[PDB]
Amino acid sequence: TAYTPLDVAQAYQFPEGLDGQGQCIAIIELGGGYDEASLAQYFASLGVPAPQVVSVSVDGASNQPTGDPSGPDGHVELDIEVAGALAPGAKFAVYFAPNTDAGFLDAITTAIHDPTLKPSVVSISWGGPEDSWTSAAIAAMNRAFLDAAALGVTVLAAAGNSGSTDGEQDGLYHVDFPAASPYVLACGGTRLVASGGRIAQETVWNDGPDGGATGGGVSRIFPLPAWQEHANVPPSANPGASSGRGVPDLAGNADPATGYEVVIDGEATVIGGTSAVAPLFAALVARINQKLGKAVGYLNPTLYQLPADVFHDITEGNNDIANRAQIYQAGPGWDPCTGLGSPIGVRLLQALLP
Ligand SMILES: [Ca+2]
């Protein structure tokens, strides 16, 4: 099982007749580059008019594809193919920074403050466990995301591809940063079975430690936000059971087993990860911005007050890949695997309309 990005947007009922025109989506990259030949062939094969793609160098880094499809080129082309396939009217600005937290910070503030490209959306699918970040870098990052919220820019981040432990074996549960930020729309991952625009079934992405699984959990750094106050977020499963910001907010297809068809450095292939969901929803927000005639910005508070039928609730599975305790599990409403669920594009747009 494999989908084009178009088949996925169809299952999530993205609003038709909108392609992101007049909008600029920013995409953060910390390594590799994209092969233009790949994009050219991919977009055409999908029937999509070649989108404008430009690179911006940050802290001396630049677009540098190595040709190795199994390298960071794959991260980069996945970001672009998936989003560019779904908002091809939008201008894509890809910011390349050194693979450091200072570079990542700098690429994000470069994007937000861009006086020329002024992106209205920032797509992020890089990060790490919050404990791997220093308190100072965490604080700089969060000022940035707040700034973003003040400028009407939406910021979206993949919640992780390693389950509730996010890759650590220090025997604790952890969420990823920057999705853990309250000012970031955290994107979880599901397993999607769909066709002709109707989802047949959608469960938690979890293919074990070998296969990867959706990030999700309870932030140990940030306290439960006011707008999450009655979303049924639990305390972390970690002893002490501190309450904290629940991750994620929304979720989309991320299971490589029901994966995305893309072309990485010439080779046809199928990928997944929550890495595909931020750019997928980045394109949804850009289409919605076009319709609105202005950037929607920071959506987290809005999302949590929308009626339930704006989402496809995910209620089965868990995102534990380290033990059999099923920490965390899906269920009715918000859960620490899939958050509010998958959005139903046309209904989110209708709620956002005057
Ligand atoms: Ca749910």
The rounded Å distance from CA 41 to ligand 1 centre is 38
**How far apart are the C-alpha atoms of 16 and 34, rounded to whole Å?**
28
Counting Cα atoms < 13 Å in the Cβ hemisphere of 167 gives 14
Strands 121-124 and 342-343: unpaired
* DSSP-derived secondary structure for 1-69: -EE-HHHHHHHTTPPTT---TT-EEEEEE-S----HHHHHHHHHHTT-----EEEEEBTTB-----S-T
Instruction: Give 69: exposed, middle or buried? Use CB within 10 Å, 0-12, 13-18, 19+.
Output: middle
Do residues 172 and 228 make contact, with C-beta atoms less than 8 angstroms apart? no
The rounded Å distance from CA 241 to ligand 1 centre is 21
Residue whose pair of structure tokens reads 């989108």 in the numeric block:
51
**How far apart are the C-alpha atoms of 119 and 246, rounded to whole Å?**
27
E strands, 215-290, are 217-218, 246-247, 250-253, 259-264, 267-271
The rounded Å distance from CA 169 to ligand 1 centre is 27
Amino acid identity, residue 277? Answer: V
The rounded Å distance from CA 330 to ligand 1 centre is 5
The rounded Å distance from CA 277 to ligand 1 centre is 17
The rounded Å distance from CA 251 to ligand 1 centre is 10
The rounded Å distance from CA 82 to ligand 1 centre is 25
Do residues 137 and 105 make contact, with C-beta atoms less than 8 angstroms apart? yes
3-state DSSP call for residue 311? strand
**How far apart are the C-alpha atoms of 58 and 140, rounded to whole Å?**
17
Tokens of 75: 């991260």
Residue 309 DSSP class? G
The rounded Å distance from CA 311 to ligand 1 centre is 10
The rounded Å distance from CA 20 to ligand 1 centre is 29
The rounded Å distance from CA 264 to ligand 1 centre is 33
Stretch (H or E) spanning 302: helix 300-303
The rounded Å distance from CA 32 to ligand 1 centre is 36
The rounded Å distance from CA 143 to ligand 1 centre is 30
CATH for the stretch 1-354? 3.40.50.200
Residue whose pair of structure tokens reads 């890809």 in the numeric block:
94
**How far apart are the C-alpha atoms of 322 and 325, rounded to whole Å?**
9
Q: How was this structure determined?
A: X-ray
The rounded Å distance from CA 111 to ligand 1 centre is 33
The rounded Å distance from CA 316 to ligand 1 centre is 8
The rounded Å distance from CA 214 to ligand 1 centre is 14
The rounded Å distance from CA 335 to ligand 1 centre is 5
The rounded Å distance from CA 75 to ligand 1 centre is 28
The rounded Å distance from CA 204 to ligand 1 centre is 9
The rounded Å distance from CA 246 to ligand 1 centre is 13
The rounded Å distance from CA 167 to ligand 1 centre is 23
The experimental resolution of this structure, in angstroms, equals 2.0
Residue whose pair of structure tokens reads 């999908």 in the numeric block:
46
Contacts (Cβ under 8 Å, ≥6 apart) of 184: 124, 145, 155, 156, 157, 178
The rounded Å distance from CA 4 to ligand 1 centre is 25
The rounded Å distance from CA 36 to ligand 1 centre is 39
**How far apart are the C-alpha atoms of 265 and 251, rounded to whole Å?**
28
Do residues 345 and 252 make contact, with C-beta atoms less than 8 angstroms apart? no
The rounded Å distance from CA 301 to ligand 1 centre is 18
Contacts (Cβ under 8 Å, ≥6 apart) of 255: 189, 190, 191, 192, 205, 207, 272
The rounded Å distance from CA 314 to ligand 1 centre is 4
3-state DSSP call for residue 281? helix
Degrees, nearest 5: CA angle 177-188-90: 90
**How far apart are the C-alpha atoms of 335 and 354, rounded to whole Å?**
30
The rounded Å distance from CA 96 to ligand 1 centre is 35
Residue 222's nearest CA partner among 206, 211, 233 is 233
Tokens of 85: 């396939």
**How far apart are the C-alpha atoms of 178 and 155, rounded to whole Å?**
10
**How far apart are the C-alpha atoms of 77 and 69, rounded to whole Å?**
9
The rounded Å distance from CA 325 to ligand 1 centre is 18
Output Rg (C-alpha) for the chain, integer angstroms: 18
Domain chopping of the chain, boundaries: 1-354
**How far apart are the C-alpha atoms of 133 and 121, rounded to whole Å?**
24
User: Helix H segments across 113-253?
Assistant: 135-151, 208-211
E strands, the chain, are 2-3, 24-29, 53-57, 91-96, 121-124, 128-129, 154-158, 176-177, 185-195, 198-204, 217-218, 246-247, 250-253, 259-264, 267-271, 311-312, 342-343
